[PDB]
Swiss-Prot record:
InterPro entries noted in UniProt: CA_dom, CA_dom_sf, Carbonic_anhydrase_a-class, Carbonic_anhydrase_a-class_CS
Result for mutant: H61G: Impaired activity, not rescued by 4-methylimidazole (4-MI)
Name of the protein this chain belongs to: Carbonic anhydrase 2
Gene that this polypeptide is encoded by: CA2
Organism: Homo sapiens (Human)
Impact reported for G141R: In OPTB3; complete loss of activity
Regulation affecting activity: Activated by X-ray, histamine, L-adrenaline, L- and D-phenylalanine, L- and D-histidine, L-His-OMe and beta-Ala-His (carnosine).
Binding locations of Zn(2+): H91, H93, H116
Variant or mutagenesis effect after changing W2A: Impaired activity, not rescued by 4-methylimidazole (4-MI)
Enzyme Commission code(s) on record: 4.2.1.1, 4.2.1.69
Single Gene Ontology BP annotation: morphogenesis of an epithelium
Length: 257
């Protein structure tokens, strides 16, 4: 199976998922000196007031906080998007040490982690149909740096002990994802892909410029998770990030001057 180990990591994925070498793969490096301000981009509308989180799952590659997406509760609109995108899950990618972990980079800088809030375009009816479309998904990406603690992250880190290994889940209701956002919603955007197999080219990426700060203790708790299942040899869940892929024939646009 694919992973981020010594023998099944990102450089191997193309053998089962040839789109790994496609034309709109993610993540990418964001060159802040080449991305152009686009005055036609609108403010992002993040409407998370009615979000309903349900569960948190260790799926062997990350942990996903899952939401009820059976109605337009938590939605993303505006920005570069046409239409309404419903929040289905969020997860993170992170490193074995603070100097790596993000998927996107900014002028080659790697952040300690990156949060992905995954949304699907409701014009396609369900998530599985949305991932087959070039405008099916919108993923809001937020960098994490280590410094002050993020109060709104602590409920997530304190449940992690209960989902240490692959296939474990826990009830996770009433979690408010607004507590994971930075102050500013200035962003970069470009067309890309899922960053894990099947690597489908179905994503409008929206990457916030302002990182959130998390504490060393918070990220250390992500790094105590396991990729393996219960009872199997322990492999810490660290360095679950794909490195930057070729930009090819794409432009990265900035929402801000
Ligand atoms: C189809 C099963 N895979 C997913 O639904 C999926 C969602 C988001 C991302 S990411 N890392 O680009 O936000 C990758 C994969
Ligand atoms: Zn992701």
């Amino acid at each position: 199976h694919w992973g981020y180990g010594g023998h099944n990591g990102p450089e191997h994925w193309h053998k089962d998922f040839p789109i790994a070498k496609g034309e709109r793969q993610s993540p990418v490096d964001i060159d802040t000196h080449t991305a152009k301000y686009d005055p036609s981009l609108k403010p992002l509308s993040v409407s998370y007031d009615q979000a309903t989180s349900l569960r948190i799952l260790n799926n062997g590659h990350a942990f996903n906080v899952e939401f009820d997406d059976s109605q337009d509760k938590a939605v993303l609109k505006g920005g570069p998007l046409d239409g309404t995108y419903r929040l289905i899950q969020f997860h993170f990618h992170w490193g074995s040490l603070d100097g790596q972990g993000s998927e996107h980079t900014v002028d080659k800088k790697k952040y300690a982690a990156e949060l992905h809030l995954v949304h699907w375009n409701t014009k396609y009816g369900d998530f599985g149909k949305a991932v087959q479309q070039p405008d099916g998904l919108a993923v809001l990406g937020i960098f994490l740096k280590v410094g002050s603690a993020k109060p709104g992250l602590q409920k997530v880190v304190d449940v992690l002990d209960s989902i240490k290994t692959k296939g474990k889940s826990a009830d996770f209701t009433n979690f408010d994802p607004r507590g994971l956002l930075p102050e500013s919603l200035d962003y970069w955007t470009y067309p890309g892909s899922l960053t894990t197999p099947p690597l489908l080219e179905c994503v409008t990426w929206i990457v916030l410029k302002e990182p959130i700060s998390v504490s060393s203790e918070q990220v250390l708790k992500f790094r105590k998770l396991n990729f393996n299942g219960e009872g199997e040899p322990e492999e810490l869940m660290v360095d679950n990030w794909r490195p930057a892929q070729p930009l090819k024939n794409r432009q990265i646009k900035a929402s801000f001057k």
